[PDB]
Structure 1
């Protein structure tokens, strides 16, 4: 009840395993990285 202001697209989304907002997920899809040490198993 924020006076008619809608923050759903920047508030966290509980459904996703990572509680990222819609815009945060959009940004993470937009940027593609090259590894971050995700425990290389050889």
Structure 2
């Protein structure tokens, strides 16, 4: 579905992003989709990732 080449697939699966690529919080931290401990704890203090 991603329309990516195999090398691009390997590259995307080796960088974990540190779970920092999340923006929205409601619905209980997006039902754990966004890492709770890091993202939600940070952004309850006015820290957002655009």
TM-score (norm 2): 0.40
Higher helix share: 2
Structure with greater Cα Rg: 1
TM-score (norm 1): 0.45
